[PDB]
Amino acid sequence: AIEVKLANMEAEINTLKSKLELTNKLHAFSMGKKSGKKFFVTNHERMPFSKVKALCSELRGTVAIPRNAEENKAIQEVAKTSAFLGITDEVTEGQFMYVTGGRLTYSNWKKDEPNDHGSGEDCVTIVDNGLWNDISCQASHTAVCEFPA
Amino acid sequence: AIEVKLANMEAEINTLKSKLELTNKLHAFSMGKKSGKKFFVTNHERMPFSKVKALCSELRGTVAIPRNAEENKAIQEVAKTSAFLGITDEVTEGQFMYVTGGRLTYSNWKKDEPNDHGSGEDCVTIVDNGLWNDISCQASHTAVCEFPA
Amino acid sequence: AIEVKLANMEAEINTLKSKLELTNKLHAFSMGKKSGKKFFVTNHERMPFSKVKALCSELRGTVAIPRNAEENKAIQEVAKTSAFLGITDEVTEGQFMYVTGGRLTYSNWKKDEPNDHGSGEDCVTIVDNGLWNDISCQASHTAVCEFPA
Numbered sequence: 386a387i388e389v390k391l392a393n394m395e396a397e398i399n400t401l402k403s404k405l406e407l408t409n410k411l412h413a414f415s416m417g418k419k420s421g422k423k424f425f426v427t428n429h430e431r432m433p434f435s436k437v438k439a440l441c442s443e444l445r446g447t448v449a450i451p452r453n454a455e456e457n458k459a460i461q462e463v464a465k466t467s468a469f470l471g472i473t474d475e476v477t478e479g480q481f482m483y484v485t486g487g488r489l490t491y492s493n494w495k496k497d498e499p500n501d502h503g504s505g506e507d508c509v510t511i512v513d514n515g516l517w518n519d520i521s522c523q524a525s526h527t528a529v530c531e532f533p534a
Numbered sequence: 535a536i537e538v539k540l541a542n543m544e545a546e547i548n549t550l551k552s553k554l555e556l557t558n559k560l561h562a563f564s565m566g567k568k569s570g571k572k573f574f575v576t577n578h579e580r581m582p583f584s585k586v587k588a589l590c591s592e593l594r595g596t597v598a599i600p601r602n603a604e605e606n607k608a609i610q611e612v613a614k615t616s617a618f619l620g621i622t623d624e625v626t627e628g629q630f631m632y633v634t635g636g637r638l639t640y641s642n643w644k645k646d647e648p649n650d651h652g653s654g655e656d657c658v659t660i661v662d663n664g665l666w667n668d669i670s671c672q673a674s675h676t677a678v679c680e681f682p683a
Numbered sequence: 684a685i686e687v688k689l690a691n692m693e694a695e696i697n698t699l700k701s702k703l704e705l706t707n708k709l710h711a712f713s714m715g716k717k718s719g720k721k722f723f724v725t726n727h728e729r730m731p732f733s734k735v736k737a738l739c740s741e742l743r744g745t746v747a748i749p750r751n752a753e754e755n756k757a758i759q760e761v762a763k764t765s766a767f768l769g770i771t772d773e774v775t776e777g778q779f780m781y782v783t784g785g786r787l788t789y790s791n792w793k794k795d796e797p798n799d800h801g802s803g804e805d806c807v808t809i810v811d812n813g814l815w816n817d818i819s820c821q822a823s824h825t826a827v828c829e830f831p832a
């Protein structure tokens with residue numbers, strides 16, 4: 386009994402793992418995930434950057450980061466409005482970095498941005514043009530999370 | 535060996551339970567669930583009130599119930615059309631009750647409603663502009679379920 | 684006690700199986716599955732027929748197959764653009780069969796189709812007005828999968 390049931394439960398666990406992997410794939414597919422492409426998702430809620438980071442962290446994803454013009458357009462299409470990107474110059478003013486680490490490679494700044502306007506701006510939002518504007522991390526913008534290709 | 539295998543499998547099970555919870559969260563997020571807000575969803579199928587209750591119950595949810603102006607609006611946008619709410623006066627005419635218990639608090643009746651028209655109307659549907667109308671529980675309207683915030 | 688832990692484990696696994704089934708039901712509901720009806724899903728990605736087949740197959744579904752006017756309409760709504768159907772005359776030219784077996788019964792061909800045009804056309808796409816056109820299996824059209832009622 387004991388050994389047999391233990392061996393059976395190991396097979397039961399492996400079967401359930403396979404089914405959940407399937408459930409995940411089907412949900413990503415219905416969410417619009419394209420083969421070999423990372424996918425972006427939003428609930429259309431607007432909130433402060435700190436809240437977006439916490440939310441995408443819970444979902445085991447990260448705040449959306451466009452690494453090139455294609456991804457940038459992909460994020461623009463998902464958000465539909467101004468949305469925070471996983472980019473900030475919180476650590477050293479003027480030096481934008483990915484929240485996942487590293488200096489910015491690709492960028493699509495609007496003319497004369499980033500300017501750390503007025504009281505200060507350390508976060509970044511992709512606007513209704515695909516272009517970027519640095520903005521207050523405390524302002525509320527659309528939460529867009531990113532998951533691996 | 536055995537005690538070790540058992541412990542290791544219990545750990546695998548804990549990991550799977552969290553992963554499933556993650557799946558549920560990402561799904562709700564992708565479908566528009568806002569932070570600290572109930573999750574409203576529909577398959578866009580119209581049916582008798584009896585079936586909507588059976589359906590939502592099978593999904594471990596309940597028929598959508600607007601507790602305030604904001605929730606009523608949220609339900610309105612998810613539904614798009616006439617949909618039953620979890621409210622009926624099948625016990626005492628004029629005394630509408632939530633299917634989950636308790637007397638009606640917030641309401642948003644349309645002019646001349648509730649009128650328990652014709653042979654009687656004990657169910658409630660959210661209609662145009664988010665206004666309410668009592669209707670026969672036998673009539674078919676959109677099924678909208680709610681899940682806790 | 685080893686046996687007590689084994690029994691709890693069984694209960695944990697069974698509880699997980701039931702929760703996963705609920706998650707699958709809620710996902711299907713959210714993606715529009717109607718009671719007693721199979722449902723269709725798409726990620727809106729265009730690809731060759733062999734790829735769509737492989738993709739749906741991996742998800743334990745099949746390339747969408749309209750069995751009547753209602754399903755044809757549902758598939759048309761989901762696709763939004765030209766999409767492959769699980770129907771082909773690859774095995775015997777002129778005799779269309781469902782990828783899952785059996786001769787084609789219900790059809791919705793555009794006037795003058797199927798015509799195995801040019802070098803040949805063995806696949807089928809639902810196009811404008813929901814009508815059908817036989818096309819090369821090598822062409823890239825929208826991937827739409829169907830899942831059991």
Ligand SMILES: CC(=O)N[C@@H]1[C@@H](O)[C@H](O)[C@@H](CO)O[C@@H]1O
Nearest residue numbers: 498500501502506518519520521
């Ligand atoms: C709060 C807000 O929208 N601030 C923007 C600022 O980020 C931008 O750089 C500037 C450009 O003229 O326009 C506004 O001041």
Ligand SMILES: CC(=O)N[C@@H]1[C@@H](O)[C@H](O)[C@@H](CO)O[C@@H]1O
Nearest residue numbers: 646647649651655667668669670
């Ligand atoms: C203004 C008025 O009498 N409206 C009634 C409504 O109360 C009733 O629920 C419905 C039943 O189909 O018939 C009419 O629309």
Ligand SMILES: CC(=O)N[C@@H]1[C@@H](O)[C@H](O)[C@@H](CO)O[C@@H]1O
Nearest residue numbers: 795796798800804816817818819
């Ligand atoms: C009327 C006619 O011959 N139409 C053909 C169509 O059947 C074929 O599938 C397609 C392939 O590119 O080329 C034309 O559109």
Ligand SMILES: [Ca+2]
Nearest residue numbers: 474478505507
């Ligand atoms: Ca700063």
Ligand SMILES: [Ca+2]
Nearest residue numbers: 474501506507
């Ligand atoms: Ca700054």
Ligand SMILES: [Ca+2]
Nearest residue numbers: 500502518519
């Ligand atoms: Ca700025």
Ligand SMILES: [Ca+2]
Nearest residue numbers: 623627654656
């Ligand atoms: Ca009554």
Ligand SMILES: [Ca+2]
Nearest residue numbers: 623650655656
């Ligand atoms: Ca009544």
Ligand SMILES: [Ca+2]
Nearest residue numbers: 649651667668
């Ligand atoms: Ca009425």
Ligand SMILES: [Ca+2]
Nearest residue numbers: 772776803805
């Ligand atoms: Ca042929």
Ligand SMILES: [Ca+2]
Nearest residue numbers: 772799804805
């Ligand atoms: Ca052919």
Ligand SMILES: [Ca+2]
Nearest residue numbers: 798800816817
């Ligand atoms: Ca043709």
Ligand SMILES: [Cl-]
Nearest residue numbers: 506507521522
């Ligand atoms: Cl800031």
Ligand SMILES: [Cl-]
Nearest residue numbers: 655656670671
């Ligand atoms: Cl009634």
Ligand SMILES: [Cl-]
Nearest residue numbers: 804805819820
């Ligand atoms: Cl072909």
